[PDB]
Design an enzyme around this catalytic site. Structure first.
Site, PDB file in Angstrom:
ATOM      1  N   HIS A 122       0.948  -1.171   0.080  1.00 23.87           N
ATOM      2  CA  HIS A 122      -0.269   0.251  -0.044  1.00 23.87           C
ATOM      3  C   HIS A 122       0.616   1.349   0.406  1.00 23.87           C
ATOM      4  CE1 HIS A 122       0.644  -0.754   4.219  1.00 23.87           C
ATOM      5  NE2 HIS A 122       0.661   0.055   4.382  1.00 23.87           N
ATOM      6  N   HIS A 124       1.232   4.942   1.792  1.00 23.29           N
ATOM      7  CA  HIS A 124       0.481   6.376   2.117  1.00 23.29           C
ATOM      8  C   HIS A 124       0.879   7.793   1.504  1.00 23.29           C
ATOM      9  CE1 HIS A 124      -0.295   4.013   6.209  1.00 23.29           C
ATOM     10  NE2 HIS A 124       0.568   3.065   5.822  1.00 23.29           N
ATOM     11  N   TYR A 205       6.281   9.152  12.867  1.00 22.34           N
ATOM     12  CA  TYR A 205       6.047   8.018  12.130  1.00 22.34           C
ATOM     13  C   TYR A 205       7.032   6.785  10.488  1.00 22.34           C
ATOM     14  CZ  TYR A 205       3.043   4.445  11.329  1.00 22.34           C
ATOM     15  OH  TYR A 205       1.900   2.994  11.010  1.00 22.34           O
TER      16      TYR A 205
END
Ligand code: NI
Length: 248
Positions: A122, A124, A205
């Site tokens: 995926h 982001h 993060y």
């Protein structure tokens, strides 16, 4: 304390509190009339000039961020598909920016390809700027999913009938292969767009993830990242962690 690490740290810190949307671009496994369409079934290299250029940028971002102190055994097919998806994700972003007449230099964005434990590949995307406001999040998600589903059907390398291509297009739309971060809610209740803070999310993060160096990929690892300032693109994993440390 290379200039590259310092430069990335300063660029992010200046944008520490800039509110941005959070999207995830993904795909899901599909079987149509016995034909298997998996995560890496989109390997056509479409001969559109911008797409070609974007794919070259992904390739060289991979090349420059590769640490040769350690060996890398990621499958060639996996790298290829990620480079292609990088170009397609960005094509979608730029198409919607065009719809809104937004000058690319007025936009802050960050892209990171990952492999999730359950969902696999995926991507982001953080994106925002002065021409963006929270109420526009749902529209952005819907538009991005239109272009994402359109480009995926064009890039699909599985031989499909027209009926099958249309079915795939509607699956990618109806099942929301572009998601938008919202506040936690109930199924019946409204969902509210949840903007995040650009520099903070990146440094605290996304830059903390472990680099994928094998096939199969380590769960939760990242492949490739890039941003609108070309600041994090070429950073090796160790350099990314140094940025987080300096950012604090
Ligand atoms: Ni992720």
């Amino acid at each position: 304390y290379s200039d590259e690490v310092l430069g990335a740290t300063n660029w992010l810190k200046e944008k520490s509190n800039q509110e941005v949307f959070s999207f995830v671009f993904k795909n899901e496994n599909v079987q149509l009339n016995g034909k298997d369409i998996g995560w890496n079934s989109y390997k056509k290299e479409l001969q559109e000039d911008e797409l070609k250029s974007l794919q070259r940028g992904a390739e060289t971002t991979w090349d420059q961020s590769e640490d040769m102190e350690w060996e890398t055994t990621v499958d060639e097919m996996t790298k290829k598909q990620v480079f292609i998806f990088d170009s397609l994700v960005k094509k979608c972003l730029f198409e919607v920016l065009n719809t809104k007449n937004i000058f690319p230099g007025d936009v802050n964005w960050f892209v990171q390809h990952e492999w999730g434990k359950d969902q696999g590949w995926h991507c982001h995307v953080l994106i925002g700027g002065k021409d963006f406001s929270q109420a526009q999040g749902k529209w952005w998600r819907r538009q991005l999913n239109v272009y994402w589903s359109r480009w995926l059907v064009t890039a699909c390398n599985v031989q499909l009938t027209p009926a099958e291509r249309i079915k795939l297009r509607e699956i990618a739309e109806d099942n929301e292969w572009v998601t938008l971060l919202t506040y936690k809610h109930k199924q019946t209740k409204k969902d509210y767009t949840k903007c995040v803070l650009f520099g903070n999310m990146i440094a605290y993060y996304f830059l903390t993830k472990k680099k994928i160096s094998t096939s199969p990929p380590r769960d939760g690892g990242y492949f490739l990242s890039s941003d609108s300032g070309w600041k994090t693109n070429f950073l090796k994993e160790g350099e990314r962690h140094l940025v987080s440390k300096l950012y604090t």
